[PDB]
Amino acid sequence: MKASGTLREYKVVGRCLPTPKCRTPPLYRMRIFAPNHVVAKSRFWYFVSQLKKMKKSSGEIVYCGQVFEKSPLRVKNFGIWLRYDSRSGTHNMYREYRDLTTAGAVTQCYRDMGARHRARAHSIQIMKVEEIAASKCRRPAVKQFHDSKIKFPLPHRVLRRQHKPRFTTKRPNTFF
Amino acid sequence: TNTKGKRRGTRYMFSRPFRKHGVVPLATYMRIYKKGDIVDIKGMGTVQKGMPHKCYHGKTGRVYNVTQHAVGIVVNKQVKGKILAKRINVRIEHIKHSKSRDSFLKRVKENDQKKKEAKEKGTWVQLKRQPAPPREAHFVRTNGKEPELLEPIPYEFMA
Amino acid sequence: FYVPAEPKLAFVIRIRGINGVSPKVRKVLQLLRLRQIFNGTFVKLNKASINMLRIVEPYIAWGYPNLKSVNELIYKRGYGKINKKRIALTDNTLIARSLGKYNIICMEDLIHEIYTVGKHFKEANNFLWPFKLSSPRGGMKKKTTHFVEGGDAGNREDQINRLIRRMN
RNA sequence: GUCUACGGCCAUACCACCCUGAACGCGCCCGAUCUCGUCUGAUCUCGGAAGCUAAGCAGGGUCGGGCCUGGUUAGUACUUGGAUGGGAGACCGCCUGGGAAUACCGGGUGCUGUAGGCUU
RNA sequence: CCGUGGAGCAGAAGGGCAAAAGCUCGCUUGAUCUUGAUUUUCAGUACGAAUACAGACCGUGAAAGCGGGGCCUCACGAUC
RNA sequence: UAGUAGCUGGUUCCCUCCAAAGUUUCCCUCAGGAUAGCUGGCGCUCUCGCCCGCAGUUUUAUCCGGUAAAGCGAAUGAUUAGAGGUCUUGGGGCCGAAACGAUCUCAACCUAUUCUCAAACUUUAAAUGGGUAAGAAGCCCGGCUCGCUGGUGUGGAGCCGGGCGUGGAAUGCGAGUGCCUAGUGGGCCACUUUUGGUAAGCAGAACUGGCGCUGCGGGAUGAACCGAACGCCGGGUUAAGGCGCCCGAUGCCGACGCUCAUCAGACCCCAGAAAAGGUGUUGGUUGAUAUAGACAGCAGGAUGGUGGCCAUGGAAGUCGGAAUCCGCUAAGGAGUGUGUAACAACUCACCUGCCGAAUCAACUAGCCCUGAAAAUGGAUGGCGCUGGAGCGUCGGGCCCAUACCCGGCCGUCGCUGGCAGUCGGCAGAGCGAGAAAGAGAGUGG
RNA sequence: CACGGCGCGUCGCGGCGCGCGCGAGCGAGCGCACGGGGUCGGCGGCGAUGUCGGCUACCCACCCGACCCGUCUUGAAACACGGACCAAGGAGU
RNA sequence: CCGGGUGUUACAGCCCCGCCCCGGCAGCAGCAGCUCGCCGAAUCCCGGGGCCGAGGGAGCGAGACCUGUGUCGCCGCGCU
Numbered sequence A: 001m002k003a004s005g006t007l008r009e010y011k012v013v014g015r016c017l018p019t020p021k022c023r024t025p026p027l028y029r030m031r032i033f034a035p036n037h038v039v040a041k042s043r044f045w046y047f048v049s050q051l052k053k054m055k056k057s058s059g060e061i062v063y064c065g066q067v068f069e070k071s072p073l074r075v076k077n078f079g080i081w082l083r084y085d086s087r088s089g090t091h092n093m094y095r096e097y098r099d100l101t102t103a104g105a106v107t108q109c110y111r112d113m114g115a116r117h118r119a120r121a122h123s124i125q126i127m128k129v130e131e132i133a134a135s136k137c138r139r140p141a142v143k144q145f146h147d148s149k150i151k152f153p154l155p156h157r158v159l160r161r162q163h164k165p166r167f168t169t170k171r172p173n174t175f176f
Numbered sequence B: 001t002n003t004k005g006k007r008r009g010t011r012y013m014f015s016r017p018f019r020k021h022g023v024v025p026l027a028t029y030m031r032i033y034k035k036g037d038i039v040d041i042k043g044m045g046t047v048q049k050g051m052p053h054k055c056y057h058g059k060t061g062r063v064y065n066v067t068q069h070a071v072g073i074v075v076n077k078q079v080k081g082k083i084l085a086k087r088i089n090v091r092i093e094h095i096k097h098s099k100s101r102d103s104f105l106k107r108v109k110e111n112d113q114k115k116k117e118a119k120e121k122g123t124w125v126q127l128k129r130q131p132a133p134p135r136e137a138h139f140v141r142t143n144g145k146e147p148e149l150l151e152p153i154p155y156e157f158m159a
Numbered sequence C: 001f002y003v004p005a006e007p008k009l010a011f012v013i014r015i016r017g018i019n020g021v022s023p024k025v026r027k028v029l030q031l032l033r034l035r036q037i038f039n040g041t042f043v044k045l046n047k048a049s050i051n052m053l054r055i056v057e058p059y060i061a062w063g064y065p066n067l068k069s070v071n072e073l074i075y076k077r078g079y080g081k082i083n084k085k086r087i088a089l090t091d092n093t094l095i096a097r098s099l100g101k102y103n104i105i106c107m108e109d110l111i112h113e114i115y116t117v118g119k120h121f122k123e124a125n126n127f128l129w130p131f132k133l134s135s136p137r138g139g140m141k142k143k144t145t146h147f148v149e150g151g152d153a154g155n156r157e158d159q160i161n162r163l164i165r166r167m168n
Numbered sequence D: 001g002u003c004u005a006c007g008g009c010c011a012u013a014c015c016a017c018c019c020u021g022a023a024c025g026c027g028c029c030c031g032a033u034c035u036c037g038u039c040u041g042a043u044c045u046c047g048g049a050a051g052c053u054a055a056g057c058a059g060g061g062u063c064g065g066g067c068c069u070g071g072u073u074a075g076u077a078c079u080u081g082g083a084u085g086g087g088a089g090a091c092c093g094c095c096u097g098g099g100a101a102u103a104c105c106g107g108g109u110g111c112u113g114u115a116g117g118c119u120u
Numbered sequence E: 001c002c003g004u005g006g007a008g009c010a011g012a013a014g015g016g017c018a019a020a021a022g023c024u025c026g027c028u029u030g031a032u033c034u035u036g037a038u039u040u041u042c043a044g045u046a047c048g049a050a051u052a053c054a055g056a057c058c059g060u061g062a063a064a065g066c067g068g069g070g071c072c073u074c075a076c077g078a079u080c
Numbered sequence F: 001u002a003g004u005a006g007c008u009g010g011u012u013c014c015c016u017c018c019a020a021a022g023u024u025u026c027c028c029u030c031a032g033g034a035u036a037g038c039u040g041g042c043g044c045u046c047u048c049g050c051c052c053g054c055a056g057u058u059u060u061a062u063c064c065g066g067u068a069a070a071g072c073g074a075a076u077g078a079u080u081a082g083a084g085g086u087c088u089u090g091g092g093g094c095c096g097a098a099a100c101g102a103u104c105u106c107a108a109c110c111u112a113u114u115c116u117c118a119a120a121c122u123u124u125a126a127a128u129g130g131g132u133a134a135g136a137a138g139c140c141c142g143g144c145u146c147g148c149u150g151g152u153g154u155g156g157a158g159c160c161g162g163g164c165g166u167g168g169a170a171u172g173c174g175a176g177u178g179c180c181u182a183g184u185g186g187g188c189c190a191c192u193u194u195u196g197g198u199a200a201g202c203a204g205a206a207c208u209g210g211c212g213c214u215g216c217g218g219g220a221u222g223a224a225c226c227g228a229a230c231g232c233c234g235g236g237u238u239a240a241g242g243c244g245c246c247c248g249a250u251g252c253c254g255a256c257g258c259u260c261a262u263c264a265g266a267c268c269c270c271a272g273a274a275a276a277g278g279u280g281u282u283g284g285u286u287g288a289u290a291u292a293g294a295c296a297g298c299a300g301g302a303u304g305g306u307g308g309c310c311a312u313g314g315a316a317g318u319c320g321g322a323a324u325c326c327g328c329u330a331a332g333g334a335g336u337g338u339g340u341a342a343c344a345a346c347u348c349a350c351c352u353g354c355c356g357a358a359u360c361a362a363c364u365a366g367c368c369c370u371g372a373a374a375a376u377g378g379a380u381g382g383c384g385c386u387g388g389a390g391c392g393u394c395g396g397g398c399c400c401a402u403a404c405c406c407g408g409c410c411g412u413c414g415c416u417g418g419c420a421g422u423c424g425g426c427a428g429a430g431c432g433a434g435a436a437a438g439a440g441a442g443u444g445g
Numbered sequence G: 001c002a003c004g005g006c007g008c009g010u011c012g013c014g015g016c017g018c019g020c021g022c023g024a025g026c027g028a029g030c031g032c033a034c035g036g037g038g039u040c041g042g043c044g045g046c047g048a049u050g051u052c053g054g055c056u057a058c059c060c061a062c063c064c065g066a067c068c069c070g071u072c073u074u075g076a077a078a079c080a081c082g083g084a085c086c087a088a089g090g091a092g093u
Numbered sequence H: 001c002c003g004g005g006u007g008u009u010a011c012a013g014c015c016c017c018g019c020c021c022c023g024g025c026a027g028c029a030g031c032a033g034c035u036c037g038c039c040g041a042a043u044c045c046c047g048g049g050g051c052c053g054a055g056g057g058a059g060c061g062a063g064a065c066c067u068g069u070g071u072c073g074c075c076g077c078g079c080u
Ligand SMILES: [Mg+2]
Pocket: C019, C020
């Protein structure tokens, strides 16, 4: 996978072709976070090949569709169970993020993995994404945003658009 | 460099299969080869008379001469940048009828029969073997049971 | 669930140069009539076509063309192969002579037959000269790698229409 | 149901032990004048028909060994093609396709051709 | 009594072989005369070696058959 | 005598088209030849404007194999460890005159197991791959010839005559054939496979592609790397790579993080580093204990049998050898350490008072740091850069190659293309138009 | 609505389809143009001793590019060899 | 005003859940000119900037009762 842009969540269900052995193979459903449906289908085939004895040549994508966010206006806490490959050994972890959308949280997860462990999208295997109550949250970086009377200033505002007035007689102010 | 012996590097090619040594079954001797049959070459080490050279092992040729105990066959050999259709004499043990031709012969008989039939009926029938076409549209019926989730399993070391 | 029928028509664009090509890939590209970078052609799908395209996946970007894509490709870049000569199709009589015996007599017949993969799709496609497409405006993502891993090679189901819009 | 003569495929047919065989047959069996051959009529060859299923042979049995065929191992090992992927390296991950083999757990234990009998 | 080869088949090794290709006897000289074709290295040339035939004289066996050297893979030599 | 030279050096105008080899076999052959291979030239026989063939390709069938892997409870050959049996033998002993009569044993032995292996092992056994077939030279009939084979006008072969076209997988493409022939016969490099070697910009192979023979954009620089192969130009767009300045392009109010280096880091080949460590910082895994009040921190206790037994010259707990008990208890180890020869003394484990909410470890992985020493002054290309101009994951926009698209021009090749129809007061100006063929000539109702 | 005559209409299924005759397959003009590759039936200036034109060629400046040829060679700008410069002669007959 | 504690609608709100016509009403991939898509036989209109203009006898109608003309073929139209 190439974690291009913001990811989208896809529900993908697939099955083996009917064979003389069995008329109706069971349908298997999976949640895939992907830039588009093509890579979503590729990832589905990869995961189902690891899990069951299924291959794209001996299977078919029964359905593949984007699943939209149920409540994209409520800020939520997301717990992600994840499996990734390091330079020496592979590790399971659990990370919490804070965002409005499941796809946004997973994209945050990919960027954070790249930033903190140099792990790449082809190394990360995302396992579980769940909405987690603020009481069940356990990472302080997320927990510290759980209060009714949140209040903090913007202390040191760095001047942007530094080049539009490229030569200015003021020395800029950073306190607003 | 290597050695130019006639049987170099044949210890596995000319050997007998496991638990299949001994008397050659007589059905091999009791087969009829005529002029023009397509036939396979498979050297058998049990008999050393009329053994084909190792470079024709696994090759398919055409019979052009039938003799008391052996058969002369024309087979193609790739020599450098050119192919020579050369004729060799092989004793009947190291030979076997090719089944690649009988399928085509049976297909010829069968489509000739279905062409003779329906000729009076005037209907249309397909004879050429079309390649595997793309799958057509259909419906996949769920029987009230929703598809079950599949998730990767956590890593945990075995060794 | 209703699984739609597998697509029967694909569009293929060569996206790699002439230098340093394996002989097998070179032969398949010659058979598919992609002898030049940013050349394109239509291919009807079956087991043989699937395996042939799989052999040359790194060198081509192929997908399932849309009706508008077929229309635009035929009308703007479509030239006919008449008398072993590349003739631009500026009149219906040029099509009518080369494909009259197959009841293709104008642009509409040619486009319909190509898009629906008719009985004489082979004759129509062979009469159709390979399309010479301009370089993709806006650039490519990454020529060397596969589309799934963020590149441009390989099979992209319907994004070939987005590609065509900028390559023609 | 089954046997004999000649077989085809050559263990699903072999090996070990146990039980049962009506009729025909196959056998064991009784002798050495002739044919024939031995140290020895033991074997081979020859001439027979008192007795017997004891043995061979046939059928069946064994939570049997083996063999044959499946599942698991396993989409694991390996592997075609690709990347200005990772790593100091050793090597590894991914994309596109193919895809094994032990241990372990199931099922089975000869089919059949021509001619001639028995089951009146 | 058990014994699938765990021995032997001249030699190195590999392949092959159980009423045999091994061991023991009987009879013999296909290790003989002759024209062609083919394979092996190959240039698809020789030598060497080998393979199917064909034409005579034979050997052996009741016979079917088998045999023109050694179970196969090596043991050899132009012009003058 | 201009002696010979398989060996050096040189070998004189333009444009156009085609375009290599350093490999096979033989040679007193190894700096050379001959011969195949690769090249060019000259043609020729047909072909289309129903059909033939061919293919560095696939598909459908059908065979071929012993590598990768795997196996040793399967053969061969190596190989570790314990179990259960016996006299089948040997070795230490023992009762026995002796006795397989008997006691242990150590062994060899057998039977089930068990650890690890094979380029010259293998029951199994891939992927990639190597043949063959996919029709007219085919099928189905009738009849003749034969000195061969023959129970048999049996078998086989060859002949004639006749009937069947839905041209029997996909895709692509004109094909076949004949002479004459130059140069070459020192090669090198790269992914993958692979032999020798500690290794090498070493030596030797297999496949494919390159360099040589080749310019162009990028890698600052560069025979081989990445992109792309080239007639002379205009416009547009890209590939690889980039966009602080050199230097065309981010002078985006770019997104999220990580990192401070008194040796920072900065892009395939590639031009420099490891094992081992960090209470630097950032994530993650696992296990603990905490209002029956922890973690610190500040203070009080830290006892008897007994100076436990064997010991040493001396060991009272603190050099040595096993164990490690009890009653008192809120608790105290026949002791965690400092100390003396031994004590003594101090101190810890453990429990209490104050304090009143989170605190301990053991691993693991990112960046940074230690490990880290060479000689002219010195090189992420340089300047320089730390709300990055560094590192990881990403988004728009932009820049340009001789590449791609459109146009002009030159030339080559192909259409073995068209034109003798300039048919004119003696004439009537066509054979571009989807459909094999007459703007036909005249005779009767 | 790329529908438009009259008939004989079975050329027909029940009318539509779809055939046979109708001086027998001849209505004409003008005009506009997204129509087999640009025209203007549109214009404006400056011109006699100081001005107009002259690609190239003479000299000079600037930006970019740019290592000296021939030769053997896997590899030449080479710390490989020949070469100061110029004229004439000079090698597949 | 702040801090700590209790708690479950109060002098703020939040989430889920049967129905009331899926309750009703706009509207709808919304110029609330950026809350998140894929497209166009389910797509047309207008405008701006840059480069170029290669080629040069295409015929019309006139009818052997005439001999003109240089705006012509295909295509799309308008008028009589
Ligand atoms: Mg390249």
